Design a protein around this nucleic acid. Structure first.
Ligand SMILES: Nc1ncnc2c1ncn2[C@@H]1O[C@H](COP(=O)(O)OP(=O)(O)OP(O)(O)=S)[C@@H](O)[C@H]1O
Ligand SMILES: Nc1ncnc2c1ncn2[C@@H]1O[C@H](COP(=O)(O)OP(=O)(O)OP(O)(O)=S)[C@@H](O)[C@H]1O
Ligand SMILES: Nc1ncnc2c1ncn2[C@@H]1O[C@H](COP(=O)(O)OP(=O)(O)OP(O)(O)=S)[C@@H](O)[C@H]1O
Ligand SMILES: Nc1ncnc2c1ncn2[C@@H]1O[C@H](COP(=O)(O)OP(=O)(O)OP(O)(O)=S)[C@@H](O)[C@H]1O
Ligand SMILES: Nc1ncnc2c1ncn2[C@@H]1O[C@H](COP(=O)(O)OP(=O)(O)O)[C@@H](O)[C@H]1O
Ligand SMILES: [Mg+2]
Ligand SMILES: [Mg+2]
Ligand SMILES: [Mg+2]
Ligand SMILES: [Mg+2]
Lengths: 331, 341, 319, 360, 329
DNA sequence: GCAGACACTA
DNA sequence: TAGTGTCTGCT
DNA sequence: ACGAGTACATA
DNA sequence: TTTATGTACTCGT
């Protein structure tokens, strides 16, 4: 193509949205009717909220009408209280543009405009409080849509005024069909479960899985030998730690000597592997194994959670993982 | 340039001898530049991530990329706090680093991206030190590189993604630049000293330099230049390693902490902290290497070291969630002296 | 339709004797109204205790039937500024009006706490120039914002909370003048729901009588709830954790109180708490403020309040 | 008009015998003004014994209502001068302008530097940043809280003229309640005598409790008050409550938490727990300063959550000083972070100045 | 625009008469006897979001006044500016001038009044007090801590209780009658525990369920439809997850939680509140167990709000529950 | 707390 | 010329 | 009268 | 230093 896969296989229509169907059916049957409520799309990133709302916009009014009937606001522009109090209020105050005979003949063209605030969780509390009565005052002439991957940031009135559509994460089971379809459409070879492993690596994000699949395909055509893609290639491309290094990490932990642990931690950090992946791998090794005791499992789960939460708030990965290994070594 | 670190910098993938698997992946991506996703190069410092991004650009954009220039623009924010952050312009690619005061990086990034969004044909953008972003410029990028996916390509150069939020990692490709082991570092230093003129008494000096650098090519080259100038281009194994005054005073501070757990000792430690923060050194790495120095003392026990690393992690999260860098360092040092006593 | 006048102005005092509260300030105002040479005063304190109606009644007693000729009613409602207020004060003070031989032109500046420093320092000049002709009067919610020299050149008559006796007397007067049935339980319910405030007390009484009619404690409870500081103080001083949790949910989560208001009230109560050791209060405030931050990013979950109470009891138990 | 005049203006000092307290500054100003013409004939080459000859203009400061303007007027009129006010020897016009701090300050300082007429400045604060141009261009005549004897005699005269009973041993409480404000004392006597003509020791405690002239403490005074082991003891906490400690913070809330962190190390604690060493107490105290670091970050951020200001007092000012409170070994040290920040910012500016110069 | 039926259930239905407001029976009858008798004071309406404040005040204005109340009543909200300039110009001119349409008094609506500045409230309190003879002020606020205590004392405070089961049941019955829809008892119960005392939430979920069915008519919405459309974990599913956590080993419980999350795309956070809600009525003999449970779950939801890895957070929930219950003996 | 200055008496 | 005693500035 | 530049408070 | 929102003020057109 001429542009990446993530924006190449975006769902053009509502039916192309896989996994998420509990909201797609609602939007599909709202296409025939016209009582569209205020939408609050909340879920993990990469679950297709923006794709779903763009598909709904395209089906509701058609490509011609959405240019003058859809207002797009995001963090790329100003989102202060003055902008909320002026631009959105003015846009909701105006009457709807007259639909064309062509548009009404082909598209249903409901008589209202939609203002979509993607990344709505980034707005200040003052702006959210100001943007409360703009919906109810001008509901007969326009509707609002909110997209935000943290629903908790949204205040209670703003969340109440909109309908909450939860976009569930695209795991291995739900999103296997979409990745498979991408595989035969792009002629990407899967050996046994490469797609399933790629979906396992991604934290419910199909965009990440599609990106890893695209990278594996790029390697596949660069080698040019026409060989079957293995799970080793996609796990190395993702950046996860090989299992043998995890095993020797556990062996060093079981020893209990601080000096060897610190030396091997420095050896591991000069490799550059991300500490979040190490926490995840230590989790899936220690929890799944049966030789460790229940109290040890509870302690290590709490320690891994604390390490991951601290890694979310910046900090240095070296200190976090070294302290994690020291903690689990003295349990 | 007279400096030794930047003269011997690869200008293409074929000239890159840092690693081979990553070079293979980079030229695999460069084989089909059409479907190029947003990139995120991560790893320890000194691995040539900037150089790899450059060489990928000339692999994609061809020659002339290193012909950069400096352009000055005007930025407006709240009140009248005028900002004049420079953009390092060039044909095709445009390079800019968000090295602002860390409070109003939104306006610069947004203005530059909307200005370059006017028009092979897609313009790549690399910004450095992306880890220390204020979580708001990342929010701007989250939509800016999503909507402008056919005209603007965005590349992350950062050493970690722990401060980086999830959506930025989601809409970018995660590729890793590792640090080399001692042997190929010694090999590249031997190649350099073969290119210019240094007489080596023993080959072990390069191995000792590699051990001192602890996986950093820029540090290794700067150290090699320092030894070459100090020893008059005659390397000797008896010559000791040269350490920064920063690490020297940290070592003296650690010895002071371990030798006297008194409040007055904490006063001169606070004075040293004042001076070092006045030397414009980020406090996170200061705390990191300070703790590594406390863990590198023989007389320390195991419970003391465990408590030291615990307080290290706690004050690391406190330093991440704060602006007063001196407060967390002083608190951590006070807890260290409390643990030792 | 046109309503009857509210109970505010239907029973606003007209003379200084009608105002209840602290007897010293009121009878000082009465004596200085008998004399005539009223000195400049700054009135401050919690609002609704007679900080403005007392000044109005004093001005009425000073200026008889010529009140409208030589009284300049100023407030934040009309307009405030430096070179607007000083212009109007200069215009009013430079009016050579034939006052009685022992009277001055009283100027009342209601709600002047939010006034700028320049306006206050110009008011100082207007005082030191036209003290022989006009005498000012300040009624503010907080005298701290007022610059110190203004309070230096004034007769400070700061009031306090009205006791239950004064509120009871005034409410009985309103009841007898409005023909309202009352009960002692209803009276004390109005007293507690007043928080020592006249306007809130009369509002609650008017609501009760125009609603349930009979003024009893139960009807007042239906029309208005108990103040949140008392319930929060009972929350943060309970013995067991389950009792505190159930009090929290039943009294401030099933009654619709917003979580941020709950945490702010907890902070204020702990800051103004007695019978507790100082370090205990400080650490309770630290953890309550941590919960306050947690509410502030957007997490208004009931479990955040539950964890706040759990940590409160953990610190109270002394490990 | 008569018998309808305020006591503060009807009982006004007619001569410098009538003014009470700060008499040394009165002679200083009198000798400055009397020798001003001598200095003018000397072309301001050198000063006299008091070091006031070289000064072109004089200047007064102190608590409000202490008699600065009154003493200036009386000095001008006894020596013989034409009093004139430009604020917002007998035929020589003297400029008596008040409230220099009430602001132009540079132009006023220049006019003070070059003045062909006697000039007197009256203000309440000298160390203000806006008063920096007036640091070395005006005389440093200083007034203060006056002695409780001459004002006592003046109050005896005023009371025996106004016919109301009082006790000799009330001047001390009257002066300390009003922070040495004589005008407020006159206003208090008038206000009480309107109703109570028996202002004595039996009523003076309620009088003080109704008329405390509360004034905000300077940062240094805040630090000393906050770093006192008495106010954190069981007995001393009742007098100076936690609310008062929070209220003390808000006087200089920008500078309060920086001062506590700077000198919580130099004070020996007096409320030490059994087993709590001076080093261990600092470790907990420094932890709370880092705990208060997050709150300051959130308040002064893009969110602007200024309802959290009382929280920043407890974590950063009150609790850190609540465990190391006691008698201080040394002196109050001003925070060095502000000087460090300015030095680092220029060093940060120099860090990115040449770096972008040599980037290409 | 294009008939009233072209509106969401939250906005198509909106009360215009005081009799169409349930739940706040005490407040509605008190204000009815305020306005019919003629002794309506200045109002302060306080309650949770979406509990019928502005609907109540608009219905009150329609009841007292005529249809044409454009110049009779002024509505002010945070959608437009509400600085002290607004109070000193628009409110000033509205309250100062006697009514032009009629000869009666006036009413000014301070909608979401908890979002104005302190100086605005300081000017507004005196605006209320000077011109209370011919103008009344009704204050709509969700947060009472952003209002100065003087504004609290001026207007009588009406606490809007959250709407109980009866109000929700009558309202859903009315909207089912209006829209020709049928509901199963379990579906309306799920609406009861999901609405959280809000008309907006239950009406939006009902609209989504009506749009869920392939045929809106002759089809009944069940509780399964509620749970799938709103993405709400089933109570039986939540209790099964809790039982597996509390009785199985670290492999069985982890596998069960992952299978539950993956089967229907459940959210871990909503699972956390489900477990928490089913945990208060669980008797704990150790008081410290409650402390550890509450604090650990609070940290876990804080991390979820900040985001991160979902499986690690789920195992964190499992470990927190197991360790806290390990305190049991 | 640490000086520094301004009286009162001597 | 030198003890007490108190108010004040350390930015 | 209204707009723009500057400064201060935000318990 | 901080960092938007709001208020204030005076200068200028
Ligand atoms: N259900 C789905 N079916 C098909 N593709 C999907 C689905 N969900 C996500 N995708 C793909 O995921 C990629 C990004 O989708 P987005 O719409 O950006 O998700 P998102 O919720 O907007 O993530 P954000 O904006 O960072 S919160 C595109 O390539 C989509 O095709
Ligand atoms: N002591 C009192 N006796 C009788 N009525 C009183 C008294 N104090 C207040 N009121 C009533 O309160 C109303 C007037 O309130 P104000 O005195 O103007 O409030 P305030 O005390 O001035 O507080 P602020 O700061 O001005 S809001 C009238 O209805 C009076 O009848
Ligand atoms: N030493 C004194 N003896 C007798 N009366 C005094 C004395 N000092 C002040 N007063 C009285 O208090 C009034 C205060 O007058 P001013 O000298 O103008 O006050 P001030 O000290 O200059 O403070 P400012 O400038 O007004 S803030 C005088 O007019 C007298 O009535
Ligand atoms: N008792 C009730 N009877 C019928 N509908 C109600 C009732 N209470 C609330 N509603 C509905 O709730 C919807 C939204 O509530 P509103 O009254 O418009 O807003 P609010 O309750 O004042 O809260 P805010 O301030 O707008 S977030 C309205 O459209 C009403 O239809
Ligand atoms: N393969 C290589 N050959 C020669 N020099 C290299 C190589 N890799 C890296 N370098 C050196 O690294 C320096 C730049 O490193 P840099 O990009 O700053 O690392 P990082 O991005 O990790 O900080 C260049 O001056 C270059 O000389
Ligand atoms: Mg999106
Ligand atoms: Mg009043
Ligand atoms: Mg004066
Ligand atoms: Mg409303």
């Amino acid at each position: 193509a001429q542009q990446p896969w993530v924006e190449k296989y975006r769902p053009k229509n509502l039916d192309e949205v896989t996994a998420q169907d509990h909201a797609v059916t609602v939007l599909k049957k709202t296409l025939k009717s016209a009582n569209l409520p205020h939408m609050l799309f909340y879920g993990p990133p990469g679950t297709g909220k923006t794709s779903t709302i763009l598909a709904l916009t395209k089906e509701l009014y058609g490509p011609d009408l959405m240019k003058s009937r859809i207002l797009e606001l995001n963090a790329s522009d100003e989102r202060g209280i003055s902008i909320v109090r002026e631009k959105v209020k003015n846009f909701a105050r105006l009457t709807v543009s007259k639909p064309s005979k062509h548009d009404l003949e082909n598209y249903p063209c409901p008589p209202y405009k939609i203002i979509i605030l993607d990344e709505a969780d980034s707005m200040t509390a003052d702006a959210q409080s100001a943007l409360r009565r703009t919906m109810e005052t001008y509901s007969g002439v326009t509707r609002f849509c909110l997209i935000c991957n943290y629903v908790t940031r949204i205040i209670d009135p703003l969340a109440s005024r909109c309908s909450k559509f939860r976009f569930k994460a695209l795991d291995a089971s739900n999103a296997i069909d979409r990745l498979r379809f991408i595989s035969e459409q792009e002629n990407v070879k899967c050996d046994d479960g490469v797609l399933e492993r790629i979906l396992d690596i991604s934290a419910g994000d199909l965009r990440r899985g599609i990106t890893l699949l695209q990278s594996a395909s790029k390697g596949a055509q660069y080698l040019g030998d026409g060989k079957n893609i293995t799970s080793t290639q996609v796990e190395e491309l993702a950046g996860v730690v090989p299992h043998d290094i995890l095993i020797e990490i556990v062996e060093k932990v079981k020893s209990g000597d601080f000096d060897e642990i610190k030396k091997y931690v420095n050896t591991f950090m000069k490799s550059g592997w991300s500490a979040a992946s190490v926490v995840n791998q230590l989790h899936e090794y220690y929890i799944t194994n049966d030789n460790f005791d229940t109290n040890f499992k509870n302690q290590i789960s709490w320690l891994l959670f604390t390490t991951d939460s601290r890694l979310n708030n910046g900090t240095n990965e070296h200190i976090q993982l070294l302290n994690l290994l020291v903690k689990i070594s003295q349990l | 340039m007279s400096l030794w670190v930047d003269k011997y910098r690869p200008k293409s993938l074929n000239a890159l001898s840092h690693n081979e698997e990553l070079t293979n992946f980079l030229k695999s991506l460069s084989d089909q530049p059409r479907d190029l996703p947003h990139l995120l190069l991560y790893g320890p410092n000194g691995t040539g991530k900037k150089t790899r991004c450059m060489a990928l650009l000339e692999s994609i954009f061809g020659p002339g990329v290193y012909r950069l220039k400096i352009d000055v623009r005007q930025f407006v924010t709240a009140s009248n706090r005028k900002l004049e952050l420079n953009v390092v312009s060039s044909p095709y690619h445009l390079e800019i680093t968000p090295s602002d005061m860390g409070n109003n990086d939104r306006i610069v990034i947004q203005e530059l991206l909307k200005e370059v969004a006017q028009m092979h044909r897609y313009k790549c953008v690399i910004i450095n030190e992306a880890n220390s972003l204020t979580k708001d410029a990342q929010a701007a990028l989250r939509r800016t590189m999503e909507k402008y996916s056919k005209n603007i390509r965005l590349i992350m150069v950062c050493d970690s993604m722990s401060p980086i939020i999830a959506p930025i990692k989601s809409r970018c490709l995660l590729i890793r630049c590792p640090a080399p082991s001692d042997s190929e570092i010694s090999t590249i230093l031997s190649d350099v000293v073969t290119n210019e003129r240094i007489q080596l008494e023993t080959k072990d000096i390069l191995k000792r330099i590699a051990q001192a650098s602890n996986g950093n090519l820029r540090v290794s080259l700067l150290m090699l230049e320092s030894m070459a100038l100090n020893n008059e281009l005659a390397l000797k194994s008896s010559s000791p390693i040269i350490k920064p005054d920063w690490i020297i005073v940290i070592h003296k501070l650690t010895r002071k902490i371990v030798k006297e757990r008194s409040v007055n000792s904490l006063i001169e430690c606070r004075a040293v902290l004042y001076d070092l923060l006045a030397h414009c050194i980020p406090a996170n790495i200061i705390l990191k290497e300070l703790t590594f120095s406390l863990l590198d003392v023989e007389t320390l026990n195991t419970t003391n070291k465990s408590s030291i690393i615990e307080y290290s992690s706690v004050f690391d999260e406190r330093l991440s969630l704060g602006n007063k860098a001196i407060f967390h360092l002083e608190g951590f040092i006070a807890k260290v002296m409390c643990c030792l006593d | 339709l046109s309503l009857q006048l509210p109970w505010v102005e239907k029973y606003r005092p007209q003379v200084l004797s009608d105002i209840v509260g602290n007897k010293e300030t009121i009878d000082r105002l009465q004596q200085i109204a008998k004399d005539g040479n009223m000195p400049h005063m700054i009135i401050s304190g919690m609002p609704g205790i007679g900080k403005t109606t007392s000044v109005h009644c004093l001005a009425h007693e000073l200026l008889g039937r010529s009140y409208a000729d030589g009284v300049l009613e100023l407030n934040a409602s009309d307009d405030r500024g430096i070179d607007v207020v000083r212009n109007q004060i200069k215009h009013f003070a430079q009016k050579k009006l034939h006052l009685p031989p022992g009277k001055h032109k009283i100027v009342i500046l209601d709600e002047a706490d939010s006034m700028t420093a320049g306006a206050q320092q110009a008011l100082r000049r207007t005082m030191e120039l036209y003290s022989n002709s006009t005498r000012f009067a300040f009624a503010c919610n907080q005298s701290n914002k007022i610059i110190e020299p203004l309070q230096s050149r004034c007769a400070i008559l700061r009031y306090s909370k009205l006791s239950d006796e004064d509120v009871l007397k005034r409410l009985l007067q309103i009841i007898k003048l409005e023909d309202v049935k009352y009960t002692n339980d209803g009276l004390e319910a109005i007293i507690f729901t007043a928080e020592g405030d006249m306007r809130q007390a009369i509002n609650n009484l008017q609501s009760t009588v125009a609603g349930h009619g009979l003024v009893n404690a139960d009807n007042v409870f239906k029309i208005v709830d108990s103040p949140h500081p008392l319930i929060v103080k009972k929350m943060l001083l309970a013995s067991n954790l389950e009792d505190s949790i159930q009090i929290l949910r039943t009294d401030l989560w099933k009654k619709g109180y917003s979580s941020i208001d709950i945490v702010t009230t907890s902070f204020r109560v702990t800051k103004n708490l007695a019978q507790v050791k100082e370090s205990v209060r400080l650490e309770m405030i630290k953890e309550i403020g941590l919960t306050h931050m947690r509410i502030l990013e957007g997490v208004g979950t009931y479990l955040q309040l539950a964890s706040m109470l759990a940590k409160i009891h953990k610190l109270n138990n002394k490990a | 008009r008569e018998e309808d005049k305020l006591w503060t203006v009807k009982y006004a000092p007619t001569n410098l015998q009538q003014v009470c307290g700060n008499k040394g500054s009165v002679m200083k100003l009198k000798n400055w003004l009397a020798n001003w013409e001598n200095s003018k004939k000397n072309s301001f080459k050198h000063a006299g014994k008091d070091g006031s000859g070289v000064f072109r203009a004089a200047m007064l400061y102190g608590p409000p209502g202490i008699g600065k303007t009154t003493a200036a007027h009386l000095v001008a009129q006894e020596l013989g001068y034409d009093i004139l006010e430009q604020n917002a020897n007998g035929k020589h016009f003297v400029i008596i302008m008040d409230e220099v701090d009430g602001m132009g300050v540079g132009q006023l300082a220049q006019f003070c530097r070059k003045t062909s007429t006697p000039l007197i400045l009256i203000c309440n604060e000298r160390n203000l940043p806006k008063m920096r141009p007036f640091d070395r261009v005006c005389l440093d005549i200083q007034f203060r809280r006056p002695d409780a004897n001459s004002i006592k005699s003046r109050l005896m005269t005023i009371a025996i003229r106004e016919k109301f009973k009082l006790d000799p041993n009330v001047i001390d409480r009257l002066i300390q309640t009003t922070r040495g404000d004589i005008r407020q004392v006159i206003n208090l006597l008038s206000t009480i005598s309107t109703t109570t003509k028996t202002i004595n020791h039996e009523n003076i405690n309620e009088i003080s409790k109704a008329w405390e002239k509360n004034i905000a403490l300077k940062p240094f005074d805040i630090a000393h008050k906050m770093l006192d082991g008495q106010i954190y003891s069981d007995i001393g906490s009742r007098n100076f409550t936690l609310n008062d400690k929070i209220a003390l913070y808000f006087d200089d809330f920008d500078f309060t938490p920086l001062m506590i962190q700077e000198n919580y190390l130099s004070t020996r604690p007096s409320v030490l727990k059994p087993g709590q060493s001076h080093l261990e107490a600092v470790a907990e105290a420094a932890n709370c300063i880092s705990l208060g670091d997050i709150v300051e970050k959130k308040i002064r951020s893009s969110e602007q959550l200024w309802s959290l200001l009382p929280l920043h007092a407890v974590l950063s000012s009150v609790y850190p000083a609540s465990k190391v409170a006691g008698h201080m070994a040394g002196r109050i040290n001003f925070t060095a972070w502000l000087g460090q920040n300015s030095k680092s910012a220029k060093y940060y500016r120099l860090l990115q100045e040449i770096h972008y110069h040599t980037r290409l | 625009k294009r008939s009233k039926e072209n509106l969401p259930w939250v906005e198509k239905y909106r009360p215009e008469t005081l009799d169409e407001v349930y739940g706040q029976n005490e407040v509605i009858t008190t204000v009815r006897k305020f306005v019919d008798e003629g002794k309506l004071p200045h109002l302060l309406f306080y309650g949770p979001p979406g509990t019928g404040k502005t609907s109540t005040i608009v219905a009150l204005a329609r009841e007292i006044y005529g249809k044409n109340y454009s110049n009779m009543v002024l509505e002010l909200n945070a959608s437009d500016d509400r600085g002290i300039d607004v109070v000193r110009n628009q409110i000033k001119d509205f309250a100062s001038t006697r009514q032009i349409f009629s000869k009666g008094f006036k009413l000014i609506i301070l909608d979401e009044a908890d979002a104005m500045t302190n100086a605005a409230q300081n000017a507004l309190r005196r605006v209320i007090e000077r011109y209370t003879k011919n103008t009344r002020f009704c204050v709509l606020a969700n947060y009472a801590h952003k209002l100065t205590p003087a504004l609290l004392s001026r207007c009588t405070r009406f606490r809007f209780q959250p709407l109980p089961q009866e109000a929700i049941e009558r309202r859903i019955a009315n909207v089912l009658v209006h829209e020709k829809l049928k509901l199963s008892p379990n579906a309306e119960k799920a609406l009861i525990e999901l609405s959280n005392g809000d008309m907006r939430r239950v009406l939006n979920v009902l609209q989504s369920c009506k749009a869920t069915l392939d045929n809106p008519d002759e089809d009944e919405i069940s509780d399964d439809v509620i749970y799938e459309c709103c993405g709400a974990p089933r109570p039986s599913d939540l209790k099964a997850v809790l039982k597996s956590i509390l009785e199985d080993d670290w492999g069985t419980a982890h596998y069960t939680l992952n299978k539950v999350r993956s089967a229907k795309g459940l959210a871990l956070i909503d699972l956390i509140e489900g477990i928490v809600k089913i945990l208060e009525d669980y008797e704990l003999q150790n008081e410290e167990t409650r402390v550890h449970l509450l604090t650990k779950l609070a940290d876990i939801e804080y991390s979820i709000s900040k985001g991160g890895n979902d499986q690690i957070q789920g195992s964190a929930v499992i470990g927190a529950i197991k360790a806290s219950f390990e305190n049991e003996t």
